[PDB]
Amino acid sequence: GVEAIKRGTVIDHIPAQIGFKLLSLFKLTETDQRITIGLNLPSGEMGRKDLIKIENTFLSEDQVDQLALYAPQATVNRIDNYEVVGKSRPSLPERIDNVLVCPNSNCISHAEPVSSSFAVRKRANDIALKCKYCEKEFSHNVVLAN
Amino acid sequence: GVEAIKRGTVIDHIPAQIGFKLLSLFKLTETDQRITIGLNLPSGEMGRKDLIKIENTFLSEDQVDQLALYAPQATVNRIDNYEVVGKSRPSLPERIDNVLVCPNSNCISHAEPVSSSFAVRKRANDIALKCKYCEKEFSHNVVLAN
Amino acid sequence: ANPLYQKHIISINDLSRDDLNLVLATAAKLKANPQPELLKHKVIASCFFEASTRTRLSFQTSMHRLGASVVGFSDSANTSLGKKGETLADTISVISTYVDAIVMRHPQEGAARLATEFSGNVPVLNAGDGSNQHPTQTLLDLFTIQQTEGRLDNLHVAMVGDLKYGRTVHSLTQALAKFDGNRFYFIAPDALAMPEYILDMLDEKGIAWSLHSSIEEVMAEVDILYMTRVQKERLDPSEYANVKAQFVLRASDLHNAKANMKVLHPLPRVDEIATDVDKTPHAWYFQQAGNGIFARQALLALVLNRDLVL
Amino acid sequence: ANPLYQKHIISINDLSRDDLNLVLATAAKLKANPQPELLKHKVIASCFFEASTRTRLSFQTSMHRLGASVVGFSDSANTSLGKKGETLADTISVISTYVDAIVMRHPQEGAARLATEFSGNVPVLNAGDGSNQHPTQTLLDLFTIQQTEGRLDNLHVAMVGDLKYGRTVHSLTQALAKFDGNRFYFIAPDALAMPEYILDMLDEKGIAWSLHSSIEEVMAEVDILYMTRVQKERLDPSEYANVKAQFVLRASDLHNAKANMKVLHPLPRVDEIATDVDKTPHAWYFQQAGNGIFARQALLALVLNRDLVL
Amino acid sequence: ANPLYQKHIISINDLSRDDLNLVLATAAKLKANPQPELLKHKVIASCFFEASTRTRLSFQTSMHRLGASVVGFSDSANTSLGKKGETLADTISVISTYVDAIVMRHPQEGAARLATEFSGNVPVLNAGDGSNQHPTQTLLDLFTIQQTEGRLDNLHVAMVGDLKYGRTVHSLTQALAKFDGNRFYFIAPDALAMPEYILDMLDEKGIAWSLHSSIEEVMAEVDILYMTRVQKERLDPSEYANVKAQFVLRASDLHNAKANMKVLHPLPRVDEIATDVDKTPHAWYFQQAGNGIFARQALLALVLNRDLVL
Amino acid sequence: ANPLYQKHIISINDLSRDDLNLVLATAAKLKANPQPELLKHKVIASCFFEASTRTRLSFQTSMHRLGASVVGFSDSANTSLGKKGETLADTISVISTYVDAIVMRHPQEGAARLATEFSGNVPVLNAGDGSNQHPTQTLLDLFTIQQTEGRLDNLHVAMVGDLKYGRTVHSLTQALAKFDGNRFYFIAPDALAMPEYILDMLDEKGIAWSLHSSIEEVMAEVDILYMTRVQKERLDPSEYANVKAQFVLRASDLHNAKANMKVLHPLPRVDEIATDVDKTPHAWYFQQAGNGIFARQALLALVLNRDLVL
């Protein structure tokens, strides 16, 4: 894993092959700021990890929580003046607004200008994701597949 | 700055925001290998740029050429024992496959199990791409909106 | 302003006990001393993108019995502009510019909830969004259960038929599960049994329920028998007919039923209730249908009116 | 009697400047202080022999907002007696014996003008006769242009898309060409460009117009951008998609547009306007649609009423 | 004479182990040394009352591969047969006065056995009659399992998919149960489980079968994997989807199967066998399709030819 | 082996001058000394996914004229193919296991070239795929121009009609541009003009073409007049009509053409060639139709037969 930027977020120990999902998904790539991405690194235990450094951008509490389904052990270090002045972990959110697709093909959502929304519930063992529109409950296993 | 590995390919001078598009389109992340990506690296040299470093991996000929539509000026570098064993730049390939989508909405390439094939022809002011299947020729601008 | 003034009525689970009651109390007032000039000058739009004549005709009668004007349609086929590229979003963005409330039935689940985001302040009411919700039917089923029994608490309600797929049985269970002391007997073919999640919720609240292979096993314990139509084509024809001595009510099965037991059905009925049942005084499905008017009048009166003095 | 009392509203070119204004001034009055009992006891017939839900629903809401009753239909298929040998002539000879005004949309050009000869004294209004006229849409487009800009004179209006075939663009040009100082930029695919005769009339009056290959060339000069839907099947699919970087509006093209510039479209819209346009304050198509009510109320109020005191 | 001469093939239940073996041994010789003028001068009716172009095409290629002529039709999308109250009995009574054999697919279970009573002496070969039989598709399956396995006995057969309603899988179980040492594994969601009467027939003969939840538990010992289509219409849009992870076959899954393992499927294969299984040597559903030509020819030859010496 | 052996005919663009000449020289010998048992024992699929009975009938007569058997279908008016999400890839992968050649017409451009990737080694002959190719109709045109003109070079070819969308005329221009000294005259209304890329290909090879307004300007030096159908749906009812005088051919018009001049047309000819041109010796569209039999047979023979010595 690497070294210094002044000010910015460092998201370390993102599993491996998830570091790109997160970039792709939450569009962290549409800034003008330097971003450094490191893929399939050692220096985090598991050996293999992805890491993302976005300078001058700091992620909010809820943005931190959007990582949770993907990278639940991600540490979101807050850097100011070259040093880590804060560390957060992703907690589970109540609503994963925007990034998932309801597996129910007759949901109105598919065809339309609406951002998806699912109420998240139950911790770790099974996460049930309930679509806002069709009000159908699904195992995160199915939603997080197509 | 992002700058040293023992062996591999360093794709340098990718013109900003294309550096992400190249990872996705050419699926460079589906390797469990050291990748260092630097997005919106300044370099007064070109204003802003992107850089992919894939380690112990060497793109070849054809692979190098596809980049031409997207990062036409990328300097691709063979790093082979801690330094530059040879450079290359994108040459326009005679056919672009798999990455482009047909504009022809009734082109059958759309429903079926088939990867797209387009043949490149630099029609004086720009490049025209004729689809393999519907044989309709299109302005690459039309094509790259898709 | 009344607690439902300008609210959107989309799903039963979105209404509290106190809301169900407010609705059900208004509905009994509008029944006895009607005010047929209360929505004088409002224009409600009846948009059936899926067509249903009995629900369309019930809601439009309710709009009329309060002196309102209707504009609206139906199809189950191409309508024209609605079909020509238009997203329900745009359809709603445009009709909320014309009318005062939108009642809408649609084939895809979540249709009326997406509408809620494009109607501005115009309330939209759900007349059935795919296999999800149909809050207006359950409100008249509860008004009828309350008006025949005296209460929505401590009832032994039996639900019969296609418990797996009928919209209505699922909403009726979630709504009665907001009141206390109820007992539910579920009588379904196991290809069509009650979903796990209805049952799971019922145990979180410590609500009593049991499963029965045939109506005769509970005939004597029951207060409300909610028949649901076993929809033939979900089964093989041979499969469908093979089942025992069925789950259809005949007048002679009513011999041991309590004096206050009523039979309810959302309609259409066909071979699930035989004609001789219509004659007995436990037959209540057509009166139920009639309470459709009064229940929907309450809901219209309440969403569209500041304070109801009745 | 008002100048349009008992007149037939068939075609835009049949209304003078002073008529367009009378209409447009009434429509602003009925908007602010409405009289929802003004056509109390009239019965208007809504005859859509071609079906259009948004126009049907707009006109019927207008009939209702003035306290009138509607009888009417729609089809785009066999209706029954209307189809069984009947000539539109006979259909009209018979409904003019029942109703007070006829609003009618029909597939063949000239349908509402032939009607005028068989309706006796009953006024008939055209809701769209084939590819010829649709005077009611242009009246609400002008009411909206006037209400966003302050005037119908000295406007730089840009018309976009299928200028060859869209009814609406042709009528809007003939109507604004009755006012002074207007400038028109026509942005169309040349397979679908403006007809020669619209242009020929515009030069007889010395009216300024220019042709543009893309909206960006005029983005900054424009007051009204009238988008029209490029209808896909008139072109080859490959042909249709091939065109440049299109003629579709996106929010970022609006960056250089004046503060008072509004985007208008007759609807349906689909890929001609992207959603991010809906958010910007230049998006005006749904408010436009809403002015449908007020504009058509004026016209109904005027044809059917002796003197309007408003 | 050969034992299947002039015999009507209606059911797998009417064919014996020895007949299965003779039809499969003929197909073998017909695949190897083809007899293209064997049914020379014979006219076969291919009467598809239910449209099924892939079975149709197979049967008709098979008829031409042997020199037979073909007349016949495909209806469902209305030809004319079975209207003006004409009975299937009269229809077959008239077609037997021309053709030498009748091949028919019909939408009602039992039709092919009724044709049998009116054809007199023209053999009736059943290409599918409602939810009941389809012998010709079992014969091509058996011929494919024997071609690839070398055996029809002592096999380990997994049956994956909708086994409740899968007609194909019910006959292959009854056909295979005619031979020895076969072991079955049924993998199906609970609402689509192998019906009881099949399970009873298996037990009664002493045949071994287990139920599994994932294909993965059984991959290693499986010889034949018969996939069948999950008919989405038999489940909810939401039920289908949330099978928690699904029953699709993917080439990764097979990274474990024995060398001899072959994935079969009656087709269409839509969603359930992914494209990457096609490049795998285990993929055999298309080669299965082509062996229908040989099982079909065996049958037409044996039924119409008194002593076949090949 | 012959050069077209086992080769798939998909486009005119993939066939060379020499191939055009070999297919046309074969047809000549097949028209003169016919070979009715050449494709004896071969089964060809005629799969018309898009219904086109005149091409169908031609291709199938051609198959029978050579002893081939035919199986296949015509859809558009629903058979069953291309539903339950079955892909064209799987459909061709299954039909290649029976037939010796596939003839297919399909509604999407590119289909025939996709079939090519899944047929393996059964040749795929394209009888029309969307707005793109149709080699078989160019080959019969070329054979008719060579039959009557004696030459395929140094010709004066007028192309009259809808050249924008005329698929037939675009391939004949590319085919004829393969030979020398040809001069073209394009006569089309402005909205239906010969698209640019054709015009570019012509110039780039040094070929001479002019645009004319009336057929009359060019009658005297024209050798081949290829009429094409003006598709009225591509124009307004009013646009079509008022072409000021029209582009119809009438026998009076030909009172001027050279002795050798022949009027060709792909058909239907509806309004554009009047009946009196039929009695004229210049009328050749029906004789053109009958030479499709010979071009079709040439092709089936060369693709399926390794060395044809006739």
Ligand SMILES: Nc1ncnc2c1ncn2[C@@H]1O[C@H](COP(=O)(O)OP(=O)(O)OP(=O)(O)O)[C@@H](O)[C@H]1O
């Ligand atoms: N100035 C900086 N610029 C960029 N990245 C930094 C900076 N400082 C720390 N990081 C990154 O932060 C990670 C280590 O930070 P930090 O000290 O917060 O870790 P920790 O989990 O608190 O570890 P520990 O107790 O072992 O010191 C590394 O991936 C270094 O990648």
Ligand SMILES: Nc1ncnc2c1ncn2[C@@H]1O[C@H](COP(=O)(O)OP(=O)(O)OP(=O)(O)O)[C@@H](O)[C@H]1O
């Ligand atoms: N050993 C290496 N490992 C990883 N990357 C390297 C290596 N050597 C060079 N690069 C990357 O190559 C870029 C500079 O290489 P190089 O000297 O080829 O550039 P140039 O364009 O020829 O510049 P110049 O003339 O200014 O030296 C840098 O982005 C540095 O990160």
Ligand SMILES: [Zn+2]
């Ligand atoms: Zn949903």
Ligand SMILES: [Zn+2]
């Ligand atoms: Zn294409």
